Symmetry: C2
Subunit: 110 residues, 2 copies
């Protein structure tokens, strides 16, 4: 009845599509850096993107956005004392409480 690795397999397939520019329907440029992704995945991970794509503003931190986008497509998030403020700034804008909380733990305990 249940396939325990299905959701991982779907996300891995979405990551591959994204790495090859396939079926990506939104792009944006932050500090000259070009990003491309799926509207549906962005809306799945960020309440900001959900409002933007269901209804109808930009950050300045390309390094933070890349790591947050990498998190959406891989479930991995490599936080460090040097990037946590960047990532926290992007995640606050995108209203992603899962990353926001992970940043607070790193900052408060380092």
């Amino acid at each position: 009845m249940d396939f325990p690795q299905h959701s991982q397999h779907v996300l891995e397939q979405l990551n591959q599509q994204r790495q090859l520019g396939l079926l990506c329907d939104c792009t944006f440029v932050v500090d000259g850096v070009h990003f491309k992704a799926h509207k549906a995945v962005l809306a799945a991970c960020s309440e900001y993107f959900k409002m933007l794509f269901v209804d109808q503003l930009d950050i300045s931190n390309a390094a933070g956005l890349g790591q947050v986008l990498e998190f959406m497509y891989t479930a991995k998030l490599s936080l460090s004392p040097e990037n946590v403020d960047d990532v926290l700034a992007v995640a606050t804008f995108l209203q992603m409480q899962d990353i926001i909380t992970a940043c607070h733990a790193l900052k408060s305990l380092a």
Copy 2:
């Protein structure tokens, strides 16, 4: 820093998008029933839809007659859940065979083997 429930949470959000009409860029009718889904998810789960949307090949026309079986297969793509009975297994296997989804095909043969 790994998030063990992330992929599951993304898929349930995509399922909620599909249950509503949100961000679904693929729509087709089977036996008078309208279906909506994401091309990205269809291509992720079905080799047939991958050939159409990703490989950009000229594929054969959709060959599905059972809307109930298609609903169950689509539900599986977005939930990983599949309720197979002796009454529906023939319907689901025919849908999964056309869509070239070996995970459902294998689960149909196993139930039939009992």
